[PDB]
Amino acid sequence: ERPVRVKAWVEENRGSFLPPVCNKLLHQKQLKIMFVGGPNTRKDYHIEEGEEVFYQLEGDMLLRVLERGKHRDVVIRQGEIFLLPAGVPHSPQRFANTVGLVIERRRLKTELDGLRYYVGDTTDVLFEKWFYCEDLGTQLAPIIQEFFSSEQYRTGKPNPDQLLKEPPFPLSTRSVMEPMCLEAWLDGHRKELQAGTPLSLFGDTYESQVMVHGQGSSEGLRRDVDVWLWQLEGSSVVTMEGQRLSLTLDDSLLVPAGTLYGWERGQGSVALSVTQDPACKKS
Numbered sequence: 001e002r003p004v005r006v007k008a009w010v011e012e013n014r015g016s017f018l019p020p021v022c023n024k025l026l027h028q029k030q031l032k033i034m035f036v037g038g039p040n041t042r043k044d045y046h047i048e049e050g051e052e053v054f055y056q057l058e059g060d061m062l063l064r065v066l067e068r069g070k071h072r073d074v075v076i077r078q079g080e081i082f083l084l085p086a087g088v089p090h091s092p093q094r095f096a097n098t099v100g101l102v103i104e105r106r107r108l109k110t111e112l113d114g115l116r117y118y119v120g121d122t123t124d125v126l127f128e129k130w131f132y133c134e135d136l137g138t139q140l141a142p143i144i145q146e147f148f149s150s151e152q153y154r155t156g157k158p159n160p161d162q163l164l165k166e167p168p169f170p171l172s173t174r175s176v177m178e179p180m181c182l183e184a185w186l187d188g189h190r191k192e193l194q195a196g197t198p199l200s201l202f203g204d205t206y207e208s209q210v211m212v213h214g215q216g217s218s219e220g221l222r223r224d225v226d227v228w229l230w231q232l233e234g235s236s237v238v239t240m241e242g243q244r245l246s247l248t249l250d251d252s253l254l255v256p257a258g259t260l261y262g263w264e265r266g267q268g269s270v271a272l273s274v275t276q277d278p279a280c281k282k283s
């Protein structure tokens with residue numbers, strides 16, 4: 001339209017979260033920006049070669065992970081933000097009356113997504129499926145149905161003929177971070193943002209870059225990947241192709257790869273800048 005105001009977009013589009021996945025995409029080019037409501041129980045663990053960034057807009061969630069072969073529970077509460085590194089199996093439980101933000105990116109021609117259901121709360125695979133992920137809005141469903149309409153589900157015995165000897169790429173062995181409370185973080189760094197220096201939220205051992213920007217401007221910029229901007233405080237002006245688009249509180253905007261842009265940020269503004277560039281992949 002664009003900018004799109006995030007809470008107005010959610011409040012309008014939440015009547016279209018449909019089971020089993022309860023998701024709807026805002027954007028689906030190089031960057032994928034999607035929202036998911038609950039209640040919604042996922043018994044499956046997803047594995048992918050890109051990174052996933054979560055931010056809880058409304059209410060809490062529970063992310064179950066496998067971190068070095070061990071089950072782990074990761075509560076992400078309203079206002080918290082968290083980055084999941086590549087190749088970690090994860091299973092998101094969302095509860096009644098919650099809305100969440102998830103970001104990911106388009107997968108390379110050779111990258112492979114997988115789904116696994118385990119036996120009980122053990123680490124033994126019961127059922128798995130591996131596929132090229134093209135359309136985040138549409139492909140998990142058919143996979144989930146297949147598990148619920150299956151012998152493995154009816155009985156709980158794995159069929160060894162349908163397991164893989166090894167996963168197609170080695171699962172990650174890194175540890176997972178703690179969720180950060182975004183606005184305790186902002187207030188914690190407000191002096192630096194007033195100064196004009198942008199800041200990395202998660203640092204550079206990841207592919208994703210979540211940069212926070214305060215007052216000031218920056219020169220003509222052209223990136224090879226999509227960029228998403230989200231205005232949290234104050235306001236700002238984006239310039240792309242002889243075209244000023246101003247952003248106010250809670251406005252957001254995807255600048256498409258290739259597109260040349262200037263950004264002017266007014267007094268006491270605070271904007272979020274997100275990028276997932278697979279040239280910055282960490283394997």
Ligand SMILES: [Fe+3]
Pocket residue numbers: 046047048052090
């Ligand atoms: Fe996932």
